[PDB]
């Protein structure tokens, strides 16, 4: 019943949001392919590529175990973790669009720092800057886009952002496959192409307006409704406008969500706002996402085949994220948590044992065409199972079970421990693979068993139930009944 359709304002916001999502996915998916390139390894980590062919030909589990090489991947997420708090502050004091702008600018400057890197300190300075971009943009871009979108197609545009991210992953994989055949400086093109959507984002981010919600929260109702009318193209926006003032009056009268978050009425949610992210990262999904090319390279794929296999993981992640829309709205959260968990579990066991039967505990041995094919196939079945379970639900259900009196705290801790464990995966996958050998896949498998047991016994169905009623579904539960008075 909100009047107002598609305007040039929402086209602009959608250009900027698409650029931001593509940037997320691209900077996530480019690092692994570039780490697998022997030009890049020669120029920044020579001690690593010496230990791979003539010297140390078969030592599969530890060829790439170097803390600086993995810092190249992880520093982005370290910086994103810290920059999310900084973006919280700057969105409050100045505005969400300012954080959008700062994130786009960080994307641009860091992409250029990466492309022009003549030493390793430049390299991870650029990565830290891309992380600053992620920290400022993941905050600002989605809720700016949702505020700007007409209520009718709002969900469609948010789903568009969501899949902009995964298609960006696939785009980065493809760019890596392509630039790897450049005779020189292909990794530069790979890391640097991020600068194009980054400057589209910088420009659009600068010219776009403060949202009517923002003007309402800083007391400019007069400007707010005029801007709402101009952004909607409808000649009266009263129904939407006073729902916005209701929302901002409600948000204003909550004192502090951090003291409410740890009162017992909300401690199921708090538990799940801490357990869901950890679990999502201890699945081992970013093993694949960050390090699929170098994993295939340690097992003896060959550069070309490793990059192509990363491309197929990207294709499967994209298609399965497509079906995850239909999946999360046809089936319940418990069903898909359980199904995806057992799928990932079977695949992790199988992959770990193929690798163990070919290389043992000493890292010496040969892959076979059939075992290489099976390892890739079950990696992909694994990421497909993740892509319609712990992937989307790992953000969906923490927001779902969080009333507005607790939602800022809930999403703060959600994103921060998710980012911290993302960082740990990126910083320690290769050294864990060295110390645990093929047993690391068994470790990830047993932790997925643990998290699925956790979901089966502790999280009740939250699909289709309203926020104001989650309380009841929480004390119908045999265990959480302990916490609601
Ligand atoms: C800590 C790091 C630096 C922060 C700089 C913030 C930036 C420029 C951002 C870049 C330009 C925009 C992409 C926002 O500047 C603009 O922000 C707009 C909100 O979006 C306001 O509508 C506008 O009035 C303001 O000038 C300038 O700060 C201003 O913030 C105002 C309060 O927001 C202050 O009243 C003002 O003393 C201050 O000088
Ligand atoms: C380098 C980032 C890679 C992706 C990481 C997950 C990420 C991106 C930001 C992560 C936080 C960074 C500090 C994509 O979001 C999800 O989109 C789903 C769509 O089906 C996918 O299935 C799922 O795998 C993916 O995690 C989560 O989305 C963020 O932005 C909003 C989107 O609208 C969400 O409203 C918000 O709360 C969430 O914070
Ligand atoms: O597709 C891979 C991505 O899936 C998302 O659900 C996770 O939040 C990210 O950490 C991961 O990189
Ligand atoms: Cl704004």
From Swiss-Prot:
Q: Cross-referenced Pfam families, in alphabetical order? A: Sugar_tr (PF00083)
Could you give a GO molecular-function term held by this entry?
A: hexose:proton symporter activity
Recorded coiled-coil stretches: none
Which spans are transmembrane here?
Answer: 4-24, 71-91, 98-118, 120-140, 155-175, 189-209, 270-290, 305-325, 335-355, 374-394, 413-433, 438-458
Q: What is the effect of changing residue 62 to A?
A: Increases sensitivity to alkaline pH and can only function fully at acidic pH (pH < 5)
SUPFAM superfamilies per the UniProt record, alphabetical: MFS general substrate transporter (SSF103473)
Cytoplasmic side stretches: 459-485
Task: Name the catalysed reactions.
Answer: D-glucose(out) + H(+)(out) = D-glucose(in) + H(+)(in); D-mannose(out) + H(+)(out) = D-mannose(in) + H(+)(in); D-galactose(in) + H(+)(in) = D-galactose(out) + H(+)(out)
Q: Which InterPro entries match?
A: MFS_dom, MFS_STP/MST-like_plant, MFS_sugar_transport-like, MFS_trans_sf, STP/PLT_plant, Sugar/inositol_transpt, Sugar_transporter_CS
Bilayer topology: Multi-pass membrane protein
Gene Ontology biological process terms from the UniProt entry: cellular response to glucose stimulus; hexose transmembrane transport
Describe the effect of residue 169 to A. Reduces affinity for glucose 3-fold
Where primarily located? membrane
Annotated localization? Membrane
Q: What is the effect of changing residue 28 to A?
A: Reduces affinity for glucose 150-fold and turns STP10 into a low affinity transporter
In which family does this protein belong, per the annotation?
A: Belongs to the major facilitator superfamily. Sugar transporter (TC 2.A.1.1) family.
Q: What does this protein do?
A: Hexose-H(+) symporter that catalyzes the high-affinity uptake of glucose, galactose and mannose. Proton-coupled symporter responsible for the uptake of glucose from the apoplast into the cells.
Q: How is this protein named in the record?
A: Sugar transport protein 10
Species per Swiss-Prot/TrEMBL record: Arabidopsis thaliana
